Amino acid sequence: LDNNVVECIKEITESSRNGKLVFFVGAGVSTLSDYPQWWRLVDKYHEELYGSPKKGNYSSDEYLRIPQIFYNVKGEMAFDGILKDFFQVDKP
Amino acid sequence: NMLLNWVRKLQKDSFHKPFFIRTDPSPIENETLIYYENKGLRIIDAASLIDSNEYDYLERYSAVMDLLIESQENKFITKDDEVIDYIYGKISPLFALQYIRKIDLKHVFEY
Amino acid sequence: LDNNVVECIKEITESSRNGKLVFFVGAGVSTLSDYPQWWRLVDKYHEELYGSPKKGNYSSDEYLRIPQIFYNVKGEMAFDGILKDFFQVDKPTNPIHDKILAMNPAHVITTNYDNLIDTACWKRGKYFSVISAEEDVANATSSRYLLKVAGDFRKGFKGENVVLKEDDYLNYDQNYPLISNLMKTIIATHTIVFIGYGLGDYNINMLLNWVRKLQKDSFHKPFFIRTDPSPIENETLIYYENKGLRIIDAASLIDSNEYDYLERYSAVMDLLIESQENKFITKDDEVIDYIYGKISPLFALQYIRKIDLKHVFEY
Amino acid sequence: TNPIHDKILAMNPAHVITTNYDNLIDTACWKRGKYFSVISAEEDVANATSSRYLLKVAGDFRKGFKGENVVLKEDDYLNYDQNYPLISNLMKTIIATHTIVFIGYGLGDYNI
Amino acid sequence: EESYDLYSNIILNSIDESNGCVYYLSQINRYRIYQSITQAVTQFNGLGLLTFGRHYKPFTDEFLARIEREMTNFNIDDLFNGMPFEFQKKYKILEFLSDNQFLYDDTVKLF
């Protein structure tokens, strides 16, 4: 409804009605379907790899490191075993 | 970030700028928007368009998307200044042909 | 004292006497000299950009993102002004700085943006050829090199002589090809000891990525000195062992508080310095082999002077 | 060993680099009595026996007269950085910090 | 202690002007005075009190701790080699000063 928004919004509808629009949908939509966010999985990995979650906040460095540590230390078998159980929950 | 780095280092202004749909509860800072705009990312902020509390993790995505879908070229038209150009935009190409059947004109006007 | 850590000490000390030791000193030692930390620098940048610093703690992404915004928003002019206001200052050398040079290093690589370590070269006596740009690589006054990833304003009062903004990291390989080419060349031929890092820095990780990506097994495994007050975790320790970083934790060897970093830094480094090969000899099992290893080459000689035998026993 | 080889070692270059798979340079070095830590494999850089390098930048036949160590095939040159990362990086380092006299080329070789 | 501290200032302030010799000589002199201090404290803390009878402590224990800090693992034979190459070929006359046994060629000729 504001300036520079209608300019952007008209170009998107222009492309959409041109049949050439492409949507880069992210992980935010999964939250709407209440899908488990991957950062929540990282905390679960910490509770298994470290035996207890850390009281400090998990940063972006903590997000990418923990699965790498979890995979090499506990092995591939333990890694994908969580995925087969935890993430196989169908949602609307 | 990775494709933005790909954009920055090996893409000129020729490529079309991707559009970002902001959905975080907090309002967007002015400085952050400028940098992303300089990189080539068009930000559409939900907090600026619609004011809601910090617990609207849901329906904030919808509020931008339905407005995006409901955007129609005829919706943007306000008065005759935006009337003649919209009409002339699609009929001017038809001027080359000598005669157009009036029954067939629904095609350009999307019925 | 621990068996896993002492075997690392033997390799570095033997290499130091061999002249093939290279110290990779980080920015942690600079805090010992009470130097403005990079955390406070990014806090200043956020304060100017937003009129007030954020109340919440800044995560890893905040450290690398905020300087990029300030460069693009406030321009290059304001970037250097804050850097000169915050970093252009003189500080005394911490005890680690001199004792880093105690083991004579063939080359020294530092991530510090300052001249704390160059003064250590001249004060100690060894003249390291300080290198901060491609011109410095071309002119090699001395074989021993001191590598500055960024370098000071000696290259002109400009902004390109630092790598702080996010884009600089992305084009670091192409913006500084020579110093990065010599960066890896030293590692392939010399033992590398990482001191002054939090085990989560970008530079140590990026280097670790290169050796883990495609290096087979020819390269030697560099050492890391974790000086964090908290003890290292076994699970974290195992991962870095596979990556090729023999972590030498400091809190494990000596238990201290969470503030006396200098006590932790000096104790482990002095442990490296004061411990010799004969120091680790415990019983007759480590007596005969140690003595034989140094005398065995002399068996070819028919007779050896008894007076100068002290040379082979390091006096 | 050709008489040219002997004339190279008069100015006793610090770290001679050669794109040769043979040991004619290596034997000629010992004929003059000058040692050289020859580095041809990716593991030679780590266990260098001295600072003066005889750089077989593409490998040699010291580990046998097989095509694995030597770089002659097209595929090896494509994977030159993939199979020999250290010795390729190290050779570049010598270029910047030394004065290089290219000798034994026709100005149109692909190696140069 | 003052001479050692003063000699630290000479080498520290000799960074510029490319003096070389003044820095090099002071560095050698710094080792010499440090060498004298090593047996100075050895002849006071050690040897008991035999020549004098009272324990004189000219240098503080803190001063002893620091001087060893920087002077640990110092070899004077490589000091000339540790000098810059420009100094090496320019002040080669002083090449024998680095050697601890420099009083050998002169004594051999006398002998």
Side-chain angles (χ1 to χ4, degrees):
Chain A
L1 186 73
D2 321 329
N3 188 25
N4 161 65
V5 190
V6 280
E7 275 89 344
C8 290
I9 219 161
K10 76 170 50 66
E11 279 144 357
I12 266 62
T13 51
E14 160 78 9
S15 70
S16 76
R17 295 167 181 130
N18 278 359
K20 310 304 173 304
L21 173 61
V22 160
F23 252 75
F24 216 113
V25 46
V29 297
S30 296
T31 72
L32 297 152
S33 301
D34 206 359
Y35 198 78
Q37 299 186 243
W38 167 70
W39 74 267
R40 205 162 302 113
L41 208 169
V42 186
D43 323 306
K44 310 305 148 302
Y45 274 171
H46 208 107
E47 297 152 2
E48 315 315 301
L49 183 68
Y50 290 76
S52 66
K54 73 191 195 77
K55 293 179 179 179
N57 207 294
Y58 297 72
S59 72
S60 59
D61 207 55
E62 280 286 311
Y63 283 165
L64 47 64
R65 266 178 294 119
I66 295 305
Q68 198 59 60
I69 326 299
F70 196 99
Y71 159 66
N72 294 123
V73 167
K74 272 184 168 53
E76 177 57 51
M77 189 33 257
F79 199 97
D80 60 0
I82 305 305
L83 273 199
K84 195 84 76 180
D85 181 20
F86 172 21
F87 265 13
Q88 186 173 355
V89 181
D90 183 64
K91 306 300 299 306
Chain B
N1 276 253
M2 148 270 285
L3 73 72
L4 263 187
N5 306 353
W6 147 249
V7 156
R8 180 206 46 79
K9 101 182 85 79
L10 266 185
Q11 306 279 64
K12 302 175 51 60
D13 301 301
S14 164
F15 89 117
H16 261 305
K17 324 295 161 297
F19 294 74
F20 189 99
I21 301 191
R22 173 99 187 293
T23 42
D24 304 1
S26 65
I28 181 171
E29 313 86 357
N30 321 339
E31 50 273 57
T32 53
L33 153 78
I34 299 171
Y35 161 78
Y36 283 135
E37 186 50 63
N38 296 139
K39 228 160 181 64
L41 202 73
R42 312 279 294 286
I43 309 313
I44 312 178
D45 185 277
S48 63
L49 300 189
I50 310 103
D51 314 300
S52 74
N53 56 82
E54 310 308 276
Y55 284 61
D56 292 70
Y57 329 113
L58 60 175
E59 171 264 351
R60 198 188 296 124
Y61 292 64
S62 74
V64 186
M65 255 300 259
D66 53 30
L67 168 62
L68 186 97
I69 301 171
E70 84 183 2
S71 306
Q72 274 72 245
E73 297 96 309
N74 278 306
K75 164 249 183 172
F76 294 126
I77 300 183
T78 53
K79 72 206 77 60
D80 42 299
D81 55 2
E82 211 163 344
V83 157
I84 191 70
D85 41 0
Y86 175 84
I87 301 188
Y88 189 82
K90 311 174 307 306
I91 304 308
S92 176
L94 296 195
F95 285 2
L97 313 107
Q98 311 190 180
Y99 175 77
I100 321 315
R101 301 158 40 176
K102 72 190 75 174
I103 47 192
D104 294 4
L105 312 161
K106 40 199 54 53
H107 297 69
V108 280
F109 292 113
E110 207 63 23
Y111 296 73
Chain C
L1 308 185
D2 168 50
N3 185 337
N4 161 66
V5 313
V6 293
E7 54 95 1
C8 287
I9 281 187
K10 269 175 288 301
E11 283 155 356
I12 177 175
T13 44
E14 189 263 359
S15 64
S16 67
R17 302 159 198 180
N18 292 5
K20 291 298 185 178
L21 164 69
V22 160
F23 262 116
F24 210 114
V25 55
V29 306
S30 306
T31 71
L32 296 196
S33 271
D34 213 89
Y35 191 83
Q37 308 173 245
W38 200 58
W39 148 69
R40 269 179 276 123
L41 189 99
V42 79
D43 170 69
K44 166 66 172 304
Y45 266 3
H46 187 110
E47 174 166 305
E48 306 310 295
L49 276 178
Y50 299 77
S52 172
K54 264 312 174 303
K55 333 321 171 183
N57 194 3
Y58 307 119
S59 46
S60 178
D61 49 1
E62 275 282 302
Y63 287 94
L64 48 64
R65 274 184 297 119
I66 299 304
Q68 189 52 61
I69 322 294
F70 196 97
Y71 162 67
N72 278 0
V73 169
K74 304 309 179 62
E76 184 47 65
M77 291 325 88
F79 206 95
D80 61 66
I82 302 309
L83 281 194
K84 178 179 305 302
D85 191 11
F86 216 79
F87 276 178
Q88 180 196 60
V89 84
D90 197 297
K91 283 300 157 293
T93 68
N94 46 60
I96 307 304
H97 263 304
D98 51 87
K99 76 179 53 181
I100 276 299
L101 275 81
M103 300 144 169
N104 174 60
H107 311 282
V108 192
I109 298 128
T110 167
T111 36
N112 306 119
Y113 175 77
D114 321 292
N115 290 295
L116 268 195
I117 207 190
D118 321 274
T119 66
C121 323
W122 268 61
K123 185 212 57 56
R124 164 59 71 120
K126 294 104 173 180
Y127 164 69
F128 290 116
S129 184
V130 48
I131 284 184
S132 56
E134 297 85 2
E135 42 269 59
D136 324 311
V137 153
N139 318 132
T141 54
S142 64
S143 300
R144 48 174 40 66
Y145 297 120
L146 174 53
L147 282 205
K148 305 282 184 56
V149 282
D152 46 10
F153 300 114
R154 281 186 296 115
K155 324 172 196 61
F157 275 77
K158 317 175 179 312
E160 56 258 43
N161 36 31
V162 75
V163 179
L164 289 197
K165 64 184 54 58
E166 168 73 3
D167 308 330
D168 274 355
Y169 285 129
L170 327 184
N171 49 56
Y172 179 50
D173 217 1
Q174 65 180 62
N175 288 3
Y176 300 120
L178 281 190
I179 87 164
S180 61
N181 171 218
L182 173 62
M183 151 56 78
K184 295 172 300 177
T185 296
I186 285 174
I187 299 162
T189 46
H190 298 68
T191 61
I192 309 302
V193 186
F194 294 102
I195 170 64
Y197 289 118
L199 249 191
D201 185 281
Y202 156 74
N203 264 307
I204 53 154
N205 279 56
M206 152 295 300
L207 189 63
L208 257 190
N209 292 134
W210 173 69
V211 308
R212 193 218 45 74
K213 164 198 52 56
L214 179 73
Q215 266 264 40
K216 321 158 200 293
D217 300 298
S218 149
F219 79 118
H220 298 175
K221 305 304 157 294
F223 307 112
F224 190 98
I225 309 180
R226 181 165 175 288
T227 73
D228 301 354
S230 64
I232 197 182
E233 301 317 297
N234 196 10
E235 46 275 62
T236 309
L237 174 53
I238 295 162
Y239 157 83
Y240 280 121
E241 292 335 279
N242 294 123
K243 208 154 173 53
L245 267 202
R246 287 221 275 286
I247 322 290
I248 301 179
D249 182 279
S252 59
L253 312 194
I254 174 174
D255 317 295
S256 56
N257 307 2
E258 55 273 5
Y259 304 110
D260 43 358
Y261 279 70
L262 172 65
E263 289 199 2
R264 270 168 282 125
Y265 274 81
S266 304
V268 297
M269 261 285 278
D270 293 1
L271 212 44
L272 286 137
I273 291 181
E274 80 192 9
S275 295
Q276 320 290 79
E277 308 186 4
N278 54 67
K279 171 68 63 60
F280 288 128
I281 296 176
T282 79
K283 54 164 300 183
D284 322 305
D285 198 295
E286 311 98 4
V287 164
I288 304 330
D289 43 355
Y290 169 78
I291 300 190
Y292 178 77
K294 296 176 179 179
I295 306 189
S296 177
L298 316 171
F299 286 174
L301 272 308
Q302 315 198 12
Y303 183 68
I304 287 300
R305 277 169 49 182
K306 329 151 42 190
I307 166 61
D308 53 5
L309 253 181
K310 68 179 77 75
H311 283 128
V312 308
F313 278 95
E314 82 189 335
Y315 279 60
Chain D
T1 76
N2 46 53
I4 310 302
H5 267 118
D6 319 310
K7 305 160 188 296
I8 320 301
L9 280 91
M11 320 64 89
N12 44 7
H15 329 305
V16 63
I17 306 172
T18 173
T19 79
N20 291 125
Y21 26 71
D22 46 4
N23 295 290
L24 309 190
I25 175 66
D26 205 352
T27 60
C29 289
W30 205 256
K31 288 187 175 182
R32 283 298 195 74
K34 309 300 194 312
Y35 86 112
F36 269 117
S37 57
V38 48
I39 287 177
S40 58
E42 59 271 61
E43 310 95 310
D44 313 343
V45 282
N47 309 132
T49 65
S50 161
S51 297
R52 308 184 72 190
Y53 310 116
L54 168 55
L55 210 47
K56 304 292 191 69
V57 68
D60 52 9
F61 297 121
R62 289 188 310 111
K63 308 313 159 166
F65 278 64
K66 337 173 195 304
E68 167 189 2
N69 43 63
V70 64
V71 170
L72 273 191
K73 71 202 300 199
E74 210 293 304
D75 298 354
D76 278 358
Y77 284 108
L78 198 142
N79 299 119
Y80 193 32
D81 306 12
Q82 280 72 68
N83 304 130
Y84 299 123
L86 300 182
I87 78 164
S88 54
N89 196 67
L90 173 135
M91 191 285 318
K92 281 187 312 172
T93 291
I94 296 184
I95 296 306
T97 59
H98 297 73
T99 84
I100 300 97
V101 179
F102 287 78
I103 175 67
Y105 288 114
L107 200 60
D109 299 5
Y110 143 73
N111 305 299
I112 43 152
Chain E
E1 49 274 58
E2 273 64 55
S3 179
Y4 187 82
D5 300 4
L6 188 42
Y7 266 116
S8 301
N9 286 6
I10 322 292
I11 55 194
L12 181 72
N13 294 4
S14 57
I15 302 275
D16 54 315
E17 317 105 340
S18 83
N19 311 284
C21 69
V22 168
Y23 165 59
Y24 165 66
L25 289 187
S26 41
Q27 203 58 270
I28 286 192
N29 209 292
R30 197 260 291 274
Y31 186 38
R32 296 291 172 228
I33 170 78
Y34 155 76
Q35 263 168 343
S36 311
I37 298 156
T38 46
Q39 318 199 337
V41 69
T42 301
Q43 270 196 227
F44 300 148
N45 310 23
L47 203 48
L49 287 322
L50 225 48
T51 326
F52 308 131
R54 177 67 215 124
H55 202 225
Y56 310 124
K57 185 196 163 185
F59 329 120
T60 87
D61 47 352
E62 293 97 8
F63 176 73
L64 271 283
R66 44 152 311 171
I67 59 185
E68 303 313 301
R69 279 175 46 242
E70 326 75 10
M71 282 325 317
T72 189
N73 195 3
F74 180 66
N75 155 13
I76 202 189
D77 290 287
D78 55 59
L79 199 168
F80 189 67
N81 303 300
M83 271 314 79
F85 171 61
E86 47 269 64
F87 176 89
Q88 199 133 346
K89 64 175 296 299
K90 171 170 68 142
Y91 279 85
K92 148 86 189 52
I93 179 46
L94 297 195
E95 88 302 9
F96 77 98
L97 271 283
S98 74
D99 185 17
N100 221 5
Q101 316 306 115
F102 75 105
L103 285 161
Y104 272 26
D105 191 8
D106 43 8
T107 52
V108 152
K109 305 302 188 352
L110 151 73
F111 161 69

